[PDB]
């Protein structure tokens, strides 16, 4: 209700202690029950997976982008929006993203 678009309920089950797991992550277009979600650095480049910009190929539309690392994701949130990662290169220094405003 707080934004009028859907979440996908994800479990997430991995261990340790502290271990932390859960929950209702932001939906992308095309996420369905029974699809796999991968969250991290060597996640597959598939819609719905989360990973650092460095790992993403240039020219791929992304959402829930961080301002700052581990803030978990700020830019591209609202319904049908997306940022576009234009540049990287192996960019040690900077990844250039275009937000939906341009």
């Amino acid at each position: 209700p707080g934004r009028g678009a859907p979440l996908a309920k994800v479990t997430f089950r991995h261990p340790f202690r502290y271990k932390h797991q859960k929950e209702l992550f932001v939906a992308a277009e095309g996420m369905y029950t029974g699809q796999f979600v991968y969250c991290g650095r060597r996640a597959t480049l598939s819609i719905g997976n989360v990973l650092p910009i460095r790992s993403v190929p240039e020219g791929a539309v992304v959402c829930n982008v961080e301002h700052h690392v581990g803030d978990r994701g700020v830019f591209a949130r609202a319904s049908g929006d997306y940022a576009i990662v234009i540049s990287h290169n192996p960019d040690n220094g900077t990844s250039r993203i275009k937000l939906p405003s341009g």
Binding site: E29, I47, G59, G80
Partner: protein
């Protein structure tokens, strides 16, 4: 058609009251959701709307995110295709 001249879908919801530019759009954009849809997993003509952007197949029960009004659309399709192409160039 049946007993319908112009056409309708929703248009009774307006009645005579309400008005035209907006009526060209709104039949189209509620009714395109209403259109039984074949589930991407199973294929049966099950898919129906749970909420805005939420779609669910009655037979298999697979529930999906999608456009507000529609099960899908051009934009989602394009994004998936680009991602797949990028992964394939990297694999190379």
């Amino acid at each position: 058609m049946t007993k319908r001249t112009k056409k309708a879908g929703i248009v009774g919801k307006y009645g005579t009251r309400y008005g035209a530019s907006l009526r060209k759009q709104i039949k189209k954009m509620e009714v395109s959701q209403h259109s039984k849809y074949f589930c991407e997993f199973c294929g049966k003509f099950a898919v129906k709307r749970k909420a805005v952007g939420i779609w669910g197949c009655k037979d298999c029960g697979k529930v999906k995110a999608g456009g507000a009004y529609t099960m899908n659309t051009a934009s989602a399709v394009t994004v998936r295709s680009t991602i797949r192409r990028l992964r394939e160039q990297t694999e190379a």
